[PDB]
Design a protein around this nucleic acid. Sequence first.
DNA 1: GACCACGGCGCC
DNA 2: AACGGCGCCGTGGTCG
DNA 3: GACCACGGCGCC
DNA 4: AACGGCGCCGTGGTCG
Lengths: 538, 537
Amino acid sequence: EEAPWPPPEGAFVGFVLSRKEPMWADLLALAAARGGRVHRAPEPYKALRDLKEARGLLAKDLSVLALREGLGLPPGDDPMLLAYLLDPSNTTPEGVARRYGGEWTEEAGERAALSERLFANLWGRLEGEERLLWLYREVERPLSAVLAHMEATGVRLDVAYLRALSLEVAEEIARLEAEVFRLAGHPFNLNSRDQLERVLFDELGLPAIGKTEKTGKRSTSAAALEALREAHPIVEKILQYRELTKLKSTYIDPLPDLIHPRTGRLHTRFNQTATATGRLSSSDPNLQSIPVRTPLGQRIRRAFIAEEGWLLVALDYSQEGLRVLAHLSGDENLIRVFQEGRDIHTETASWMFGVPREAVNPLMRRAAKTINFGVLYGMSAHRLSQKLAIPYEEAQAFIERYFQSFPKVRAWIEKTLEEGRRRGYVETLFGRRRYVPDLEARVKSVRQAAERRAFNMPVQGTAADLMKLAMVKLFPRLEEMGARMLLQVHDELVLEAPKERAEAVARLAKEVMEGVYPLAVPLEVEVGIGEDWLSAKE
Amino acid sequence: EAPWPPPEGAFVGFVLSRKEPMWADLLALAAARGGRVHRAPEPYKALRDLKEARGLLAKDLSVLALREGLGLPPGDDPMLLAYLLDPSNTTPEGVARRYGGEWTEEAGERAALSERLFANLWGRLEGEERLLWLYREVERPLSAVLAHMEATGVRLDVAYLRALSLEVAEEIARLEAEVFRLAGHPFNLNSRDQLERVLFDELGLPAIGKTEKTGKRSTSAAALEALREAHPIVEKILQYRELTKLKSTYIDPLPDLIHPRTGRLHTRFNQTATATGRLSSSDPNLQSIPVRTPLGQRIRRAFIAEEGWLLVALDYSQEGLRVLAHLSGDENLIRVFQEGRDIHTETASWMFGVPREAVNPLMRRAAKTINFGVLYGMSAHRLSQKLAIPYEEAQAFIERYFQSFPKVRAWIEKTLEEGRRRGYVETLFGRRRYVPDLEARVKSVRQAAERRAFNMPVQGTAADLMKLAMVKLFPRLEEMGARMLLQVHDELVLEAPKERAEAVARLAKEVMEGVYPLAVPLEVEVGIGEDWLSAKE
DNA sequence: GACCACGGCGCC
DNA sequence: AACGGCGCCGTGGTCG
DNA sequence: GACCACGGCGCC
DNA sequence: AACGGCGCCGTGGTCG
Ligand SMILES: CO[C@@H]1[C@H](O)[C@@H](COP(=O)(O)OP(=O)(O)OP(=O)(O)O)O[C@H]1n1cnc2c(=O)[nH]c(N)nc21
Ligand SMILES: CO[C@@H]1[C@H](O)[C@@H](COP(=O)(O)OP(=O)(O)OP(=O)(O)O)O[C@H]1n1cnc2c(=O)[nH]c(N)nc21
Ligand SMILES: [Mg+2]
Ligand SMILES: [Mg+2]
Ligand SMILES: [Mg+2]
Ligand SMILES: [Mg+2]
Ligand SMILES: [Mg+2]
Ligand SMILES: [Mg+2]
């Protein structure tokens, strides 16, 4: 059983943190295991120096803590990544242990032994799965090291700007509350959907257009209230109240309070085994959800700034998911869109709002994305008629004209579903896999739902795979140039570079991101440089 | 005609005293932009004014520049665009004739042609997004890699080769005498005509095969293999041929090609010379160095590292068969690799009737000819001669292979069916070869076309993967003070300081095996050594 | 005397 | 003729 | 008083 | 109910 620190080479580590967030956490305990022997370390933080890498469950999290402490301990093998690739419903160590063998305890030494066993166990289960193993070796494992740096680096925040914005927004919220009290007759909680329901539909008697998902009540969502906006001033004021209160409580007030003592920066987590499609997620806080669409949203992006002497470089794949679809489907009308430098989000927005291309504002573009992606990924005619404010039959027709325009897209969806029906899974271009049950369910609505999940995944997942390969390829070249990778927002990368090197960093990042794979459609990257995140995308 | 220097993004043209850039004199240099030709009065000094060589045969000029101590990387080259459009485009003369303009012997004209052919061929490649990706991400950056490789060269053990020439000369004389004695009279052993008359008329030996085009009785190793053990003269002639071949082609000429500026041997890596997407090597051909026979192994010993350095040799294991397993999805073939089997060894063992460990390189090579032969459509007739078995048993051998690997057969059929409809076949990355005669009326002409067509995606995919490995590996070698010397299709030869050689080997292995998500893992055999033989032991 | 199609064979 | 893809050597028939 | 399913909504 | 994929906020019904 037990031997003394330090462990031999190629040992698997286990550890306990005071809490989830590695940047904020205390390292309570550290152990390592090889050939079944558990070596416990009496001084956890100092014992980090003895390891060449962190190999084991949640390796990246430990590596992040190490970086915080000034130690470069890269993450290596992690059974969670093997498990996530085997089945992306594997998202936690508790779950993976339960499903495949052993138990996730709260003791470093047990965790270290589990890491070792689960590693060989999951490796064994992945035998013959050569494309999943390639993703492991060439994408997921090296990416974990990229994510560790990203987490430990963080992003600078303009604190004073945000404090001033809180005060400004508070004042607007008070004014809107009063104006809505006046308009309704009486005080109430504007943040209570139950009380808003009773006020809007009972007392004021306004038409109740939609239902809620699970409670079957009349909905107060922006969807259900959109048509009612211009007629009734109260509805406008409530939606404005909602936006301001959302942005204040979720972003404006909490974020400046999360500045970290050791760095003077804001730190997030990039969760590498959290989605069914192969995307990353971000949490604590979610820096993949920063507002950007509305006028107030744009002011929040202004608060994300570079270190003094540096600039932000923002690179966002243009119409990423649609380019990926063009490749997957081979639809040459869709391939043609890109070869001609057309933008279908702009084209749809122009039609929708009845304005030229140049007068398409970000709200409009986002609203057009919802139609373009909506129709493609199986939005009903009913919902599309409400969203475009057109008759049912004309919505039905709209849907059929899209697939008439893009017949190889339709054929691709059908092939994807037919295969998914026989195999029980769908997969990305690199062979990442998602199990989708219910493709042959008897209830139509449950089958059709399963279908939408299934033919979406290869597109969303292929795009994620391509971004991850870009990151793994780009990151080592950034370090050589004294540049940093701060954020990923799915099809977007945010970097930080010295003002001197920012032009060259932009050019290299663009090249790497656009040359990742021989697609039937060229990948194009929108680059911007700026002192803050808003101006870096102007 | 405006004055030197030219504006930025100009296309260059140049004239060399000769083919080989390492040996050539730069007679003239010009550059062109927007139709204006800027002629340089001092060619060699005018190289300093360019940021890159853009234009026809850009790599060749870049090599001359490197020789001169100037780092002028090659960029755009219409030859590469043309080669990707159709790999029958191999020369500037041909490309100009086919697509527009004329290849002259005047720098300024060549520079203007470069500009016009660039936009012309770019235009013709519109919509061909995978070919353009190969251009931007593989062929263009590779041209820079090849420039360094050419200008770096490889060290040669000159004294060793001189001693070997003397030793081989003596053997040649002895064998000639022993063959004169055995035949009755002198004659030219190097004359196939006189060997024919001596072997088949005078000595009356059976004449098993014909020559391709002259319809005479063949004196080839094929036609003489069965006759070896019975008749001592036939053995002696084959040995004579090997020694004279190796002496005249490698042993004597190579040490005389050591270059005054480097003290090394330099080759050319021709980037638009093959129908499949492979490189070729010429002047001399360092992709043809003997390896197989005992004497062949001694020649490899002559390829050595600089003092204080080691050679690193990396060769894709059963690379073409791994590529086929991916293309075909044949899971029996995928299984071979997952189990760490070697079908070349397996075939050789049964052919020669010896264990795995007693398979010598001659035997392995002979097994490769059977394994690849049968796959790529060798007739039963020829296979019966090569295995020395009855016709019917050769027929059966062929059918058992495709019974074992049914998705390979299905893959061949799909490849041919599509090639029939499109008139071309293509690699995994979309590199394309036009193959006429897939529907020819004469069976033999059709079948030939077929063999060319279903071979290409395999040979070409393998070439594409190697080129991507080179483009990815090369920049990382420079950071480590290492060099890339040679490519031999599925093989890379590097040179590194003895201290860094372990780390260079490990990085090169990683890069070469992680190039693409195949259904079969790519495995690289690595070796380190002072010479090329020992780096592969 | 100059040229080059050809057999033969080195490598993958 | 016909496994596929290259490049290099020495021979001797042909021609102006 | 503690918990958490839920509507709603920020982003891709 | 049903475009797909996430994570975060404040509300109020339920329960021991
Ligand atoms: C499946 O691909 C799409 C998008 O292409 C991808 C990236 O989002 P974003 O960058 O906002 O859209 P896109 O890149 O197409 O537009 P621009 O970056 O503005 O050119 O994210 C996916 N996505 C974004 N919003 C939605 C959405 O509402 N529905 C679905 N089904 N997918 C969406
Ligand atoms: C189409 O692929 C094959 C081979 O896989 C490839 C590489 O050659 P080499 O490295 O000698 O063979 P391989 O890599 O299969 O074996 P080892 O490296 O010895 O493991 O080169 C091709 N090749 C080699 N010799 C031949 C041959 O005689 N015929 C054909 N048709 N192809 C051949
Ligand atoms: Mg985008
Ligand atoms: Mg985006
Ligand atoms: Mg090989
Ligand atoms: Mg080889
Ligand atoms: Mg020939
Ligand atoms: Mg929810």
